[PDB]
Amino acid sequence: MARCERLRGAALRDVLGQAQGVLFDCDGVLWNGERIVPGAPELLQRLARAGKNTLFVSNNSRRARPELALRFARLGFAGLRAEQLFSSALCAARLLRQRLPGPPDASGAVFVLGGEGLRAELRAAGLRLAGDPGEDPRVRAVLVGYDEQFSFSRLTEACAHLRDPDCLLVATDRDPWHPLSDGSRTPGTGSLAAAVETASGRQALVVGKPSPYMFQCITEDFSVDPARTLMVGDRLETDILFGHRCGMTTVLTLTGVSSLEEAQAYLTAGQRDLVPHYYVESIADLMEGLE
Amino acid sequence: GMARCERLRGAALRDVLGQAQGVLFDCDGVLWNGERIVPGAPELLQRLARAGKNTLFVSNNSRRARPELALRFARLGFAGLRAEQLFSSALCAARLLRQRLPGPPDASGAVFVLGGEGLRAELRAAGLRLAGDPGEDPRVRAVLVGYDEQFSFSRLTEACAHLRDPDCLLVATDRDPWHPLSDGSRTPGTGSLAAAVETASGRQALVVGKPSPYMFQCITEDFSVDPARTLMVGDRLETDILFGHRCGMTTVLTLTGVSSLEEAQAYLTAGQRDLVPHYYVESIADLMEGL
Ligand SMILES: [Mg+2]
Ligand SMILES: [Mg+2]
Numbered sequence: 355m356a357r358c359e360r361l362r363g364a365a366l367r368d369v370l371g372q373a374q375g376v377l378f379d380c381d382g383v384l385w386n387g388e389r390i391v392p393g394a395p396e397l398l399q400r401l402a403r404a405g406k407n408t409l410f411v412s413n414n415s416r417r418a419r420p421e422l423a424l425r426f427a428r429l430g431f432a433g434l435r436a437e438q439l440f441s442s443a444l445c446a447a448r449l450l451r452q453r454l455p456g457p458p459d460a461s462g463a464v465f466v467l468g469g470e471g472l473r474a475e476l477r478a479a480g481l482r483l484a485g486d487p488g489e490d491p492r493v494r495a496v497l498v499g500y501d502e503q504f505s506f507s508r509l510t511e512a513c514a515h516l517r518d519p520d521c522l523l524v525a526t527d528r529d530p531w532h533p534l535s536d537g538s539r540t541p542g543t544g545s546l547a548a549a550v551e552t553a554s555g556r557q558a559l560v561v562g563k564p565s566p567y568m569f570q571c572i573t574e575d576f577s578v579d580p581a582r583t584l585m586v587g588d589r590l591e592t593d594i595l596f597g598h599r600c601g602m603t604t605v606l607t608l609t610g611v612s613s614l615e616e617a618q619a620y621l622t623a624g625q626r627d628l629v630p631h632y633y634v635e636s637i638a639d640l641m642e643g644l645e
Numbered sequence: 646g647m648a649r650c651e652r653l654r655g656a657a658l659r660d661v662l663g664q665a666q667g668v669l670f671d672c673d674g675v676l677w678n679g680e681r682i683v684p685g686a687p688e689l690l691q692r693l694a695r696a697g698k699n700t701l702f703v704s705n706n707s708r709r710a711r712p713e714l715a716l717r718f719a720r721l722g723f724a725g726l727r728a729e730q731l732f733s734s735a736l737c738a739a740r741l742l743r744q745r746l747p748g749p750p751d752a753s754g755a756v757f758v759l760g761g762e763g764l765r766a767e768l769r770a771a772g773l774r775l776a777g778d779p780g781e782d783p784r785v786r787a788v789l790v791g792y793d794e795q796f797s798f799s800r801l802t803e804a805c806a807h808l809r810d811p812d813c814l815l816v817a818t819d820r821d822p823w824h825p826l827s828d829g830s831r832t833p834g835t836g837s838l839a840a841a842v843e844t845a846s847g848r849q850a851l852v853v854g855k856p857s858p859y860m861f862q863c864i865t866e867d868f869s870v871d872p873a874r875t876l877m878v879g880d881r882l883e884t885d886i887l888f889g890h891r892c893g894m895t896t897v898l899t900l901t902g903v904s905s906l907e908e909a910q911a912y913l914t915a916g917q918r919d920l921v922p923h924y925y926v927e928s929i930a931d932l933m934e935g936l
Pocket of ligand 1: 379380381382383587588589610611
């Protein structure tokens with residue numbers, strides 16, 4: 355039962371050694387905007403060098419896997435394989451492919467509330483999209499992602515497709531909002547999904563953290579022992595909660611959304627699924643336990 | 646206990662109406678559908694008045710300010726209505742905001758409104774200053790969410806920025822999730838927009854319209870209404886009937902609008918008593934036989 359203790363000294367050395375792998379969130383963890391967290395690339399290098407598997411699990415639905423790979427390299431993280439990158443965009447594409455395979459050749463299209471990156475990810479998996487060139491099939495799912503073009507007319511159109519009870523409703527994630535470098539915030543997919551759910555009378559299947567589906571997506575490709583895996587994230591309600599549901603050890607890093615006082619709040623209220631096992635000021639602190 | 650969803654007719658119709666001091670009517674789906682009035686509706690109101698029964702009209706439609714709503718009654722054939730009898734969520738939101746924003750005298754701020762011209766006009770009639778109107782724009786001191794066909798991701802972002810200030814109020818005209826259009830499709834309702842704003846800002850909105858009791862408070866500031874001698878007549882179980890139960894009125898479901906008889910009997914069989922009407926009629930025209 356997590357005590358939100360500061361990981362350092364010998365415990366830090368033991369916990370990492372036992373680890374088969376570390377799961378990292380990206381935003382708030384490896385970088386903030388275009389500023390990387392100092393030490394992070396070096397940390398990743400030393401991890402790989404010590405044979406510890408690294409995967410990246412993000413709720414960000416804006417970037418398709420190729421463009422995510424380029425961001426990593428451009429920001430100084432070399433030697434990443436694309437196979438290591440799991441976004442809500444990617445796993446939503448895969449979930450939708452599997453729920454729509456059906457025997458019927460009469461595949462439909464997905465109506466997407468989101469950007470080019472999310473669309474690209476779905477096309478990469480082989481899905482057809484409403485609004486692409488040519489005839490438009492029957493819309494068979496609405497996908498809600500991070501959608502800067504969100505509009506009343508697009509909400510209305512989403513709801514029309516949803517009047518067909520066989521049309522599925524999927525959301526990339528429910529993050530409510532995200533911090534921007536200038537100090538402001540942008541609404542998250544979770545706010546857009548709440549609108550879509552309310553106007554259509556439906557509940558979405560949610561793909562991203564803290565939904566376990568994300569772990570399912572990851573385990574289709576890699577063998578993961580949750581008991582020997584660290585989940586490292588900056589956000590208690592998505593990263594930590596996810597980690598607990600999957601049985602992983604959880605590390606809150608303090609370079610992002612949540613504060614230690616938010617964690618200690620939850621601890622005192624006994625909501626243990628939101629209490630990290632450990633915390634660090636930044637992921638850089640983890641290196642003292644390595645060589 | 647009580648509501649049994651009985652058909653109001655015969656002697657029961659005669660008794661219920663005789664005991665009544667007044668009847669509260671919802672508008673859309675009850676007196677009319679789009680531009681088509683419910684046959685008999687104008688006659689009913691007239692006959693109610695001749696019998697000394699008070700009538701008031703209570704609507705969540707946040708689109709027409711009170712002057713234009715009054716002109717609509719008159720144009721569609723409802724004679725003898727005074728505008729003082731019309732209570733929309735727009736009006737009651739303006740009054741709530743006028744109550745809550747008299748304070749630092751002169752240092753009134755502005756209201757940032759997600760909604761249409763009608764709602765804007767209603768707020769201005771109450772003396773409120775609006776962000777986006779001419780001139781400066783005082784500090785924003787409230788966000789109001791209403792029916793906003795121009796709802797957009799950037800405006801949601803702007804609402805959220807005003808709401809970072811914990812002292813800025815959040816009000817919603819109502820939580821209706823969607824509304825029927827004449828062609829069989831639906832338009833998203835304020836409830837869907839409000840859910841987006843609440844989720845992205847981390848706030849709970851003060852809701853003005855039915856089934857919030859605030860709407861009844863707004864009515865009783867102007868008229869003495871004894872809930873025990875008043876009928877609440879509506880087409881929507883989850884808004885009109887719940888409202889009536891919360892305020893302690895007798896509730897009459899009419900079948901010319903959104904909800905069905907079977908939806909009501911389902912609520913009854915399920916023991917959800919606050920969603921079961923005391924009586925129903927096929928149309929409000931049926932009420933006339935009791936006069
Ligand atoms: Mg993060
Ligand atoms: Mg109605």
